Amino acid sequence: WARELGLIRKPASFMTSICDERGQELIYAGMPITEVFKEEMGIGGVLGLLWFQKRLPKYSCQFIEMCLMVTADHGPAVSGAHNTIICARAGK
Amino acid sequence: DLVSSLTSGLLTIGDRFGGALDAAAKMFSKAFDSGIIPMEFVNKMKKEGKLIMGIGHRVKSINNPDMRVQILKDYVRQHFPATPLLDYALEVEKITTSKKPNLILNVDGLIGVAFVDMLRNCGSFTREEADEYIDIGALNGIFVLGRSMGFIGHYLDQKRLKQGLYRHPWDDISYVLPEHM
Amino acid sequence: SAKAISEQTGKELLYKFICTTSAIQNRFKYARVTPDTDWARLLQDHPWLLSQNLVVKPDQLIKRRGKLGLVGVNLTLDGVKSWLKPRLGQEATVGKATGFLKNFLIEPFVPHSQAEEFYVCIYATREGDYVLFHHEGGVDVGDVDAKAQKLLVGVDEKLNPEDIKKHLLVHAPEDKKEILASFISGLFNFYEDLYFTYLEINPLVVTKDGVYVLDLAAKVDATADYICKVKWGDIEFPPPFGREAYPEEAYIADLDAKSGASLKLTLLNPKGRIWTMVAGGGASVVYSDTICDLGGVNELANYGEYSGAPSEQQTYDYAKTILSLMTREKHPDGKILIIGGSIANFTNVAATFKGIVRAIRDYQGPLKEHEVTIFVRRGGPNYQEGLRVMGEVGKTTGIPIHVFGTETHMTAIVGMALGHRPIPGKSTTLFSRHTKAIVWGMQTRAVQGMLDFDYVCSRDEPSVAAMVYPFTGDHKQKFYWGHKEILIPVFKNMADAMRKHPEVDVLINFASLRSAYDSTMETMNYAQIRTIAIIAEGIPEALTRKLIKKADQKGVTIIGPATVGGIKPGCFKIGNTGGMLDNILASKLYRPGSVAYVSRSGGMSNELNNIISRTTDGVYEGVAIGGDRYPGSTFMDHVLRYQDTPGVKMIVVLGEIGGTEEYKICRGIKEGRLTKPIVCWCIGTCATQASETAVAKNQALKEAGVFVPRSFDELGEIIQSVYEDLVANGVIVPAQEVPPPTVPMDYSWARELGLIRKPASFMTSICDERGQELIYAGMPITEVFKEEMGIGGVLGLLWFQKRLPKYSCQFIEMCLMVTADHGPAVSGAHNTIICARAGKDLVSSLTSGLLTIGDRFGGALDAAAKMFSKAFDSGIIPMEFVNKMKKEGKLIMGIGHRVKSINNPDMRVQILKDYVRQHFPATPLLDYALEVEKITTSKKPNLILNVDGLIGVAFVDMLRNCGSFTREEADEYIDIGALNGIFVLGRSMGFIGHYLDQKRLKQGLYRHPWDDISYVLPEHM
């Protein structure tokens, strides 16, 4: 009540310049979610919005998706995939 | 569950929280084997702009001291033969509390210098073992294994109070977004 | 603070760090004789005592021992042994001080004539250093300023021996003229290199063999240890020669040592009636001055302070020591306790009063038994509630307590106490409403105070353009402009701030003493900065004289070296001057007045704001110049700066004892320079060089047309008289009190004074970290270590919040010893080894091993407890339980092994089973589990009771069969997972061991070869 009638004051931590969840639309970096889906940017476009806070050009967006496609699975011999298999086989 | 709650608490024991246990041993033993005075070690450490690890604490001061530092000091004075690095660290502590009262020699610095004393002034560690166990990280493990009891205690307590999901209210945030990206 | 050093350490530093080609003599030939010293070690350590002639003299900072006759001259070893018998342990009398003699210095006696002894004295002043030399030294010189040749060497400049011969050695002997210049130049170089202040070598004796130094005297700038601790070493600063300290005085000295505040106590009279426990620097000397000026010279008991916001425990200890010192003697006329103080800056008055009234309620019986009268005056934030708390304790205890606030004059409290009255070129316009500053450093409290002042003084533009901090990168700090939230950029280097903001002209230097000099020397070469305020403290006198010199060169004015700043109402405020916005709005410092003032200390500036506010129309521009030795701008520069401003109508000046500046005020007003009415008072008369004392400044200023009150009780009366004369003459036209803008206060301040009531999450019934002792479950950490409960005991405190019995604590230590490492084959140890071989770190290796302890690995600690305790509370015979877990699938958890079967036990289940059967009273569930294992060993021999099942059933049995668990907490912890906690905390030792061991064998990255994979991929998806 004392801040709704506007008299108290509060220093607020956690500055977070990404993804304002309040309001009538889920705004990303500066661009709303309906603009994200109308401008037809893939997940590379929202990687540019959330991580870099820039609307990256449409060749860099496809390059970010190409990087997330080639840095997918590379066999289960390697150590991280091996630990995931050990924890899945322990049924976690 | 227990392992995910304790584990998501244990993945913050880094350099600012609780991982000063090894850097307050490496720094205080790298400035004791290249022997300077404490009053020049502090000058060098401020001149380089880096933090003296294991000398600062957010909430405790000299007018509000933490007692767990005193319980360890009164043990390492008696049962420990020949502990000079702790005396060096106490010298640096009072040099820094003469300026700012906030900067008090932590338990994360007292355990580091007392463990270097216990490794290199008791038996069975010569000088390559007792420096390998500082370089490898056997002093962060003391903090992680000690604080696991507290984190499991906090999991059990928040499980027994039947508390709900946490939401962190928007009046503690101040979103500072760009204009229109 | 330049303080004295002993002759032994002076000669030690001289003989060790001198750099001369001259023949120095008697190097490291001196002996220190104490009352506690022996003689065999002395003869073995210094052999020259058995070879030469000896001169012994007391070194307890005794001045002019020749005029007193305490010097042993030309004696043998038995000569000094027979002469030191009435000198060691006898209370000597020197000047006006009778004190113990406990220190003597022995020198080799030298042969010398009257024409060999000279006088060298290098003492520091504001412009530079004075090298004073006299060709006729000794004790009977007398006139130390009327005969000798002086030479002023400027700051940041060197002294050449040709200049010594030209100005200083004109009347030296010719057979000493070549070596004396070398010794004086080396002595000056050593003086400048070790940061002394006043070095007096008398009497120096240059003879044919070399140079002897008979007596020495030296004061060293004690705050230059951060630059010269390697050259000083362990300096033992001696106290002045006087009476030995009382143990309570030494107790408060120890409190000041181990505290962060300033806790001073000195008992002038342990029998008298007037005790004064007054917080503040200048507040204590002002209260003792108006005790002295009201007939209380002889019966003033103590004087001291508790300044700089002490903790509640520390102010309780100080007030307890004062209330115990005023208790042991009786005074039937009546004892008076003046718990005074000025307006505090930011401290909540109710907390310090809470400490003092704890010390009062601890001494209420003796305080009524000894007829005390407590007079309290305090101001600042929440002084209303603080004085109301003190009035509540005065009502409830029954002792007379008289609380006064900002409405009272500062020292009329001691007026109504003793029975005297009843109890009821440089610039001028430095600061403007377009003046933007640059703060240097992370001082967000001071910057938010300045921005709150800029809001409330009706100023449309913030007076912090940017902050500068090189230890972090460039970012944008979040600050509060009224209700609004603004971003203020903190820059790494000052070049970016002076590039993007060319409108600034003032840098507020909040760097510490180890970076303030370099920061303002980096600042002073920038053209836009025309004033510099250095708020730090500890900066040495040599570095601040170099700052004064470069400020006079570059034309900037400096209000730095130990200050709080200075406030110009309506335009600007330097950091933390004034205090909170409560103080700014109560003292009406938001609209421009017509009075200017100068002070030296920053503690009396708030009282000056209060007095001018209550008795005048406001303050136009007020400045405190600093609490250092050589202030960056003295009183006369600010009075001349006030003279050229069209807004000032009168000027108040608050001076102090020491330093000749009010004489410059006298000469400036007499030589036709000052016209506006000056009011002044020099605080701290209290004299119970005599040409620069406070009564000298008062008698000098009273005659010279300056309005000077008699005591400090009448300062506001004099200022009100001068103001009502100036409003009768029609020059002062007071404006109308426009209402200011309002700021919201603070969530922290509103909860501290207690009117907000926010609901708090995170209920946490464990480990109260706050307060003074790390409290565990309900028991402090000192009781944890005193009652010898191990890590099982602190597990019972943190996890279960009960005091577990000593067999159960040792049982939990036994469980954490058996559930440690069990080989690296297992899933969690394997994951820890793979993350350690991928070179990660301890917490990610242990953590990614700990994320396997679920159901199939580490789940038998809890499943074999829930199973054996569900099927024991349902009343089932062990044969029926084995058959019930047969028809439903469901192999019994906690039963089975791979090798150790029977007549070949587990040998770590046997240790736990032995401990439980020997120590646990009334263990039914282990006996039920042993009946089940006796039934199921008949099927297969290797169906022995596992250790993961035995710890489960022994733990459930311990919880529901020992004390302090009922039965519904005793299976609540089983349901929540205290057994999973036992396994995870046990196996963490093994996983950290595996991390360290794979880090120590220096293993490489793991690849898991394709011979052990067998890909079973589809055909073409």
Ligand SMILES: CC(C)(COP(=O)(O)OP(=O)(O)OC[C@H]1O[C@@H](n2cnc3c(N)ncnc32)[C@H](O)[C@@H]1OP(=O)(O)O)[C@@H](O)C(=O)NCCC(=O)NCCS
């Ligand atoms: C833990 C820590 C963040 C707490 O410090 P803090 O109370 O927040 O102090 P702040 O960072 O708010 O204030 C910064 C000022 O104090 C200085 N300072 C703070 N901690 C310092 C430290 N350990 N060593 C040297 N200087 C320190 C900063 O240099 C800076 O100086 P300045 O006044 O000239 O600007 C910090 O001291 C630290 O990182 N210590 C090393 C890690 C550690 O020991 N952690 C155990 C306790 S959590």
Ligand SMILES: CC(C)(COP(=O)(O)OP(=O)(O)OC[C@H]1O[C@@H](n2cnc3c(N)ncnc32)[C@H](O)[C@@H]1OP(=O)(O)O)[C@@H](O)C(=O)NCCC(=O)NCCS
């Ligand atoms: C048939 C044979 C292979 C079975 O041997 P086995 O040791 O009983 O092996 P099993 O796996 O069947 O034993 C499991 C038993 O222990 C029980 N058990 C196993 N794990 C259990 C657990 N955690 N908890 C409770 N019970 C468990 C099982 O329920 C079962 O008991 P059940 O009979 O009540 O069902 C054995 O008898 C044999 O070797 N026969 C060949 C001999 C021969 O003729 N040789 C040729 C002549 S030269």
